Design a protein around this ligand. Structure first.
Ligand SMILES: CCCCCCCCC[C@@H]1NC[C@@H](O)[C@H](O)[C@H]1C(=O)O
Ligand SMILES: CCCCCCCCC[C@@H]1NC[C@@H](O)[C@H](O)[C@H]1C(=O)O
Lengths: 617, 617
């Protein structure tokens, strides 16, 4: 269950397997298994980590349907593997993968946005090893994210010629979502080692209680934190040291390991330095398994802070927080969905430049490094599983339910220790409304997932579901979330270009949510905007209209004390499937795809500069 | 002298140090020494490998002048360093660096585009190590590439207000070159191990002779290759096995090591499979130092092919080659000059898409991985040192001369084994013409560098100097190169917009080069072009004008049998210092900065599809 990011220390080494691999496209529903037995014939180069789709302009890999096969060789010193447990970890293979080492199938995985690993201790041998990874890009009615088994894509555009032509068209992934289906080895691949006899398998750190939080929330007189360390392998003990920002041990305990091996307990820290948005502070929990050498160790970063929904407020360290930010995407020009830490570092700086304080991982868990980055940079995150494109067809499918539970458990197991994460999102824009039994069916599907998210998170953070612009009067699910997160496009997708009418409609629905009495925030709202299109009276697609859009809508939500956040759509223009409403993709970015600020970004920067993280409402 | 890329095998391990480091800007001519002794205070995140300049939009790091300081911690298992030689390698730190480990100065380096390394065997210790790297971005009259000590920039735009304001302006780097001065840890950083007592320090493989090359140049009846293995450390022997593309041992010898410890010899390869443009074939030379636990090994890729200038022809494997391609840059939106193998892979695919066969590393050696990529993809390279912006002020400067020799020796030492490299360039557009002694001074400066390039390369490839559009009648240097490489902008920088006149002037200079009797090629020609600007009669900056420009110019050089190549400027739009002729940088790319094809790219693709690598002229 534990998926601690690979670490190098005196007991452990990490051997990265990133670089330029060999690559071949394969079939729509199969690939030659014998490619695992020998070097790929006539291979293409393919960099990893990275989406494969934009890495070859001779081919049209964006149109590819089905399987591809990656391959590379590697060798490590015998003395490095000797006596060690050898683990091969894939940070992400999108969407499904079969992995072979030296011709042996290690196993398979389906989640396209969460890490998986294999014990390769016995499959490894001395000298060159052959690692073959088949990756499947297919989406459909039983995958998360959701594809369509027939028809059209998301927001897509009677005639007999059409029916016949459609029946013989080349097979394509038909996504029920608005972002391009970038596939492949999107995140890092690495071999790593642990001790074999006994080893640290998982660590969970929680902030249990804060006593006498300072007025500025910089410190608390006392902080009670809890630790939970799980072990694998096989009067044993683990030592736990708490290190402050300077590396000073400010607390330490030695705990007994009890048999499923586990050690758990609490630690009191006086004058604890708290983690806040805009003012990060990180401790390190060092776990050392006890017996020019010693034994196993792991260093787990964490931050001390509480999160609590109280009435219509969202309290971080007892202070009323206001979200400023956006949904993002892991999306960029050559990498596609490939992780890029240069871009992550830049984007975090841009979030500061904008005076935003938060974002949501729309619509899939992001690369782990981005959460570490936001931990140290004081940026708050809503962590979201790839459950986008869902409707009643999915709710009745047990395989989908299991994959959804897998995604929630996987995300929370991977990300539980990040102080920057303050809330979980269990879906984006599922079908929730309508008549007959449909609302009840949606509720019965999502409620146990809400409960699972609460049970899985030792910190017990709030849980939301990001809601589509729907009939809010027949939707009975969204109102039961801890925070109401709504996606609204009044004035863009309806009442188009009419901001007076858009504001009127918005205010009517806001009267509804006011009456609901839950804290509410925007998680999406915006307008496609082509940089350089200008007007004295801004029309749809102009920079001025995007600017006007946010000025009008935000003036309306400023009047509502129970409206605790504004996350717009989107941080930056991003790639989608082609279609009549997509001008080189989705253009609702306040930044261009190359991260350049449109007029609305400047306006928002000015607004957000005057809005404090705490106490705005 | 040897700088073999770090390799992992049974005798060696590589520990990458890439990732998100700590970072601070520092002073114009200094940095705080105590930053090397303890964790950086209030650090910024900075991804490495990458330029730092575009990784923080809160700061204006493009305007930064002077030093910055990088830092990170790392730990490796004691059992892995035990008894090993520990080397810390920097693939590139631009432009100069001081490196510290655990408070100790390891040493310094100048030269922003070639690797350097330090023996850290004694400076390393158990647990966390603190690695600090100060990086200097300053350029001036004694650096390569060349900066200006005062004035304005490359192609930059008496009045007392101006003189006085200039004297008090913020200090900035003033480039004598047309690409932005991206600085920092542009390429990978890694720790690696070798055996300590004796180890392989360098390998050189050369194609000495080909007997009876096949008609299609796919094979030769016999290939004589030579090996040269250098050792460090301290009846010893090294075994050398030659592996073909399938990993089959096709040849092998055991050689004696003699003292500077060295083994050298020749190997005949029967029915050798040759490396050609558009049809790569690679062998591996496995060098194993002879005495569980064994000794030392390194696997050196190579390709079997000859390069020979004969009269006005450029012969690869005895066949008359024609260059199709462009100058490139290592340049991209967030990385700056940072190496990005996703982008390298994509770019190589685009080179195939265009039906080009070559490029030049304008204006600095590229990341090593790109040469490996071109080795396997059959793309020919002209390898160039950062000697750009040079004039007579530099030729009289001993420090410049020494740095130039360092760049040539370093480049060739690093890159000698790549079959894709067919030619060295010792400078781009230096001052060579004029009256009095200036031409002779230039000749006396460059001739020994020409000679040095020939002496340093065991393959003895042709050597060129890429020549500025100058007075070809007083230039006495360019005509003495092995291949004449000219940069010409008739119709753009002069005879502006008049393609008839441009072609007339071109034909007059071509009449000059016709009599020189050297093979001649374009290494630059082009027109700034803003994608989306159109006209029925294309004017400067329109897509049509760029297209017309290449159509007319190329029609003229097609009439000259001695004109053996066309490399245009540039592959893709790239970042420059700001100025009145730079619209978001240099826009002479036939592709946009995001690698999208302008009209001229389609036209060129069509032309190049009909031009064979061999036998065009
Ligand atoms: C009156 C009907 C209103 C329809 C509301 C549906 C809006 C969905 C908006 C979409 N929501 C999800 C996101 O991934 C997409 O990029 C975003 C978009 O299209 O820009
Ligand atoms: C009338 C003749 C004036 C001299 C012409 C010199 C042209 C130099 C061209 C420049 N040559 C070098 C290259 O790095 C630059 O990017 C390129 C350019 O500006 O586009």
């Amino acid at each position: 269950n534990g998926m601690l990011y690979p670490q190098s220390n005196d007991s452990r080494i990490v051997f990265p397997l990133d670089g330029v691999w060999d690559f071949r496209t394969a079939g729509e529903d199969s690939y030659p298994a014998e490619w695992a037995d020998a070097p790929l014939p006539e291979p293409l180069p393919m960099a990893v980590p990275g989406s494969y789709n934009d890495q070859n302009d001779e081919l049209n890999l964006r149109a590819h349907y089905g399987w591809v096969v990656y391959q590379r060789s590697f060798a490590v010193p015998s003395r490095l593997v000797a006596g060690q447990r050898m683990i091969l970890r894939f940070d992400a293979a999108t969407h499904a993968a079969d992995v072979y080492l030296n011709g042996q199938l290690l196993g398979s995985h389906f989640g396209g946005f969460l890490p998986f690993e294999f014990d390769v201790t016995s499959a490894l041998h001395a000298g060159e090893n052959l690692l073959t990874v088949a990756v499947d890009n297919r989406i459909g009615s039983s995958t998360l994210p959701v594809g369509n088994d027939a028809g059209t894509a998301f927001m897509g555009s009677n005639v007999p010629a059409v029916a016949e032509a459609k029946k013989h068209a080349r097979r394509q992934n038909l996504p029920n979502f608005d972002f391009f289906n970038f596939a492949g080895l999107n995140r890092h691949v690495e071999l790593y080692t642990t001790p074999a006899d006994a080893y640290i398998a998982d660590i969970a750190i929680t902030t249990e209680r804060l006593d006498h939080i300072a007025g500025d929330a910089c410190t608390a007189a006392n902080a009670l934190i809890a630790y939970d360390v799980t072990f694998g392998g096989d009067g044993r003990q683990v030592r736990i040291s708490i290190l402050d920002g300077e590396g000073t041990v400010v607390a330490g305990v030695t705990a007994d390991i009890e048999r499923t091996a586990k050690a758990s307990g609490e630690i009191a820290i006086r004058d604890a330095k708290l983690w806040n948005p805009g003012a990060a502070y990180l401790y390190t929990a060092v776990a050392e398994l006890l017996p020019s050498r010693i034994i196993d160790a792991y260093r787990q970063t964490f931050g001390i802070r509480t999160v609590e929904v109280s009435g219509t407020t969202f309290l971080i360290n007892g202070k009323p927080f206001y979200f400023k930010g956006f949904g993002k995407h892991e999306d960029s020009y050559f990498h596609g969905r490939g992780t890029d830490d240069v871009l992550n570092v830049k984007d975090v700086s841009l979030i500061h430049w904008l005076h935003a304080n938060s974002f949501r991982t729309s619509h899939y868990p992001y690369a782990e490094s981005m959460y570490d980055l936001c931990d140290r940079e004081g940026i708050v995150i809503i962590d979201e599983v790839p459950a986008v494109g869902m409707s009643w067809l999915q709710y009745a499918n047990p395989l989908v339910a299991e994959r959804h539970r897998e995604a929630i458990r996987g995300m929370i197991a991977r990300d539980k220790n990040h102080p920057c994460i303050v809330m979980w999102s269990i879906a984006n824009e599922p079908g929730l409304d309508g008549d007959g039994e449909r609302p009840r069916q949606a509720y019965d599907y999502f409620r146990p997932l809400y409960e699972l998210a609460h049970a899985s998170d030792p910190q017990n953070r709030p849980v939301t579901l990001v809601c589509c612009q729907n009939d809010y009067t027949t939707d009975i699910t969204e109102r039961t979330m801890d925070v109401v997160c709504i996606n609204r496009y009044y004035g863009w997708y309806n009442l188009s270009g009419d901001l007076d009418a858009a504001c009127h409609a918005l205010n009517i629905e806001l009267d509804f949510w006011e009456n609901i009495g839950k804290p509410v925030m925007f998680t999406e709202y915006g307008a496609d905007t082509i940089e350089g299109i200008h007007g004295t009276h801004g029309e749809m697609f102009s920079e001025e209209f995007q600017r006007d859009y946010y000025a009008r809508i935000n003036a309306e939500i400023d009047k509502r004390p129970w409206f605790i956040g504004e996350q717009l759509w989107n941080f930056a223009d991003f790639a989608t499937f082609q279609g009549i409403i997509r001008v080189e993709g989705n253009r609702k970015g306040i930044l261009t795809r190359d991260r350049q600020p449109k007029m609305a970004a400047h306006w928002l920067r000015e607004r957000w500069a005057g809005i404090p993280d705490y106490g705005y409402k």
